[PDB]
Amino acid sequence: GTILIDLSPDDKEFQSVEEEMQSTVREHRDGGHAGGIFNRYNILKIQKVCNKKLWERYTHRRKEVSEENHNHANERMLFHGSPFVNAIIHKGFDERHAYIGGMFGAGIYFAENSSKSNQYVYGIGGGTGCPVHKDRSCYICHRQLLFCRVTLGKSFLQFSA
Amino acid sequence: MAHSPPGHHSVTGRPSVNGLALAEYVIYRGEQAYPEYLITYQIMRPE
Ligand SMILES: O=c1[nH]c(-c2ccc(N3CCOCC3)cc2)nc2ccccc12
Ligand SMILES: [Zn+2]
């Protein structure tokens, strides 16, 4: 039941999403090993992901969290990179999208920095890079990221390297 | 997946070394995220 609706580059919604993408690029401590060397993106397309069932499943849980946290969902918009973005948009997030070896336990990871999520588009550590060229810094191949609505509720603060 | 720490719905990974890094977040229930936008892009080679 997922449909993808293309946003026009002239739409304010396209423009605010592109700006969040571009402005949250940073340098990474791997010198670009996992995600490639770049300071900015060429945005090719932004699509709205519309799935009534998955939306209702999200808002249902959002309300449960909210009611457990003084009517505060603590909702953010965050990036997610994954080889399984195509499954996510059709079936939603679940346990199979979890990063088992992540630094904060087995769960589903999101980033404020778009360039951090970019490191995971081809797998953990960038895997072996693009399917076509086996290049983690491929400048030709089209990559996909998700920009997601995420309910944090009461979040456990872990200070970390 | 693991569970959230007791009494919490997520974890926030606060950067405590790299001064420029933004936060990262973990949820333990897939129902706590909705994939709103699919962004297709290329990384650009620096000039
Ligand atoms: O966007 C992210 N994706 C991922 C990510 C990590 C692992 C996966 N996998 C999904 C299930 O198969 C194993 C690989 C998917 C996504 N990790 C992050 C960690 C920190 C900040 C952001 C991310
Ligand atoms: Zn390639």
Side-chain angles (χ1 to χ4, degrees):
Chain A
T2 292
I3 74 162
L4 300 175
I5 299 304
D6 274 46
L7 292 180
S8 155
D10 303 311
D11 188 334
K12 66 180 180 177
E13 195 176 347
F14 183 107
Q15 291 167 8
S16 60
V17 178
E18 164 158 21
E19 185 55 19
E20 186 75 353
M21 188 75 182
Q22 299 289 11
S23 66
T24 60
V25 175
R26 62 171 177 88
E27 285 176 331
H28 288 273
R29 280 150 61 86
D30 71 1
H33 184 89
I37 300 177
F38 64 98
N39 306 316
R40 65 191 167 106
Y41 307 111
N42 179 33
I43 303 297
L44 301 167
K45 190 179 286 276
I46 307 181
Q47 293 163 299
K48 179 67 136 292
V49 176
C50 303
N51 184 309
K52 191 121 174 275
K53 190 166 187 300
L54 294 177
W55 180 252
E56 286 174 359
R57 175 190 297 174
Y58 176 75
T59 57
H60 182 262
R61 177 58 185 160
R62 184 176 64 186
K63 182 160 177 293
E64 292 177 344
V65 171
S66 179
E67 291 182 0
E68 287 175 2
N69 195 49
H70 47 266
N71 307 313
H72 181 41
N74 197 20
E75 186 173 87
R76 306 302 173 81
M77 292 297 306
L78 298 169
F79 299 95
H80 185 78
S82 179
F84 308 112
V85 282
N86 195 87
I88 292 159
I89 66 174
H90 290 292
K91 296 303 216 312
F93 288 101
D94 63 41
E95 63 284 348
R96 296 184 306 285
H97 303 301
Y99 178 11
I100 307 308
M103 302 248 284
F104 311 116
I108 305 170
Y109 282 64
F110 293 87
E112 289 178 4
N113 288 117
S114 68
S115 56
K116 171 51 67 174
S117 289
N118 174 76
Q119 291 182 318
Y120 294 88
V121 162
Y122 298 127
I124 293 157
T128 55
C130 64
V132 174
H133 301 93
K134 304 205 224 294
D135 186 358
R136 289 182 292 267
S137 199
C138 193
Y139 298 111
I140 306 159
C141 284
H142 293 190
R143 303 184 179 214
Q144 295 185 316
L145 273 188
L146 295 167
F147 192 44
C148 307
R149 194 174 291 274
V150 183
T151 289
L152 300 175
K154 183 161 163 53
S155 198
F156 183 90
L157 195 60
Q158 183 65 246
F159 289 68
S160 44
Chain B
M1 284 185 296
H3 297 134
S4 292
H8 300 77
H9 304 102
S10 66
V11 170
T12 297
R14 186 219 199 248
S16 83
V17 166
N18 185 350
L20 302 183
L22 302 180
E24 303 167 17
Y25 301 89
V26 187
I27 63 173
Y28 302 90
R29 301 273 304 274
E31 303 97 333
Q32 276 168 236
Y34 180 82
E36 305 232 321
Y37 300 94
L38 180 64
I39 301 163
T40 306
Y41 66 102
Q42 293 163 314
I43 56 159
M44 289 187 73
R45 188 193 287 278
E47 290 164 40

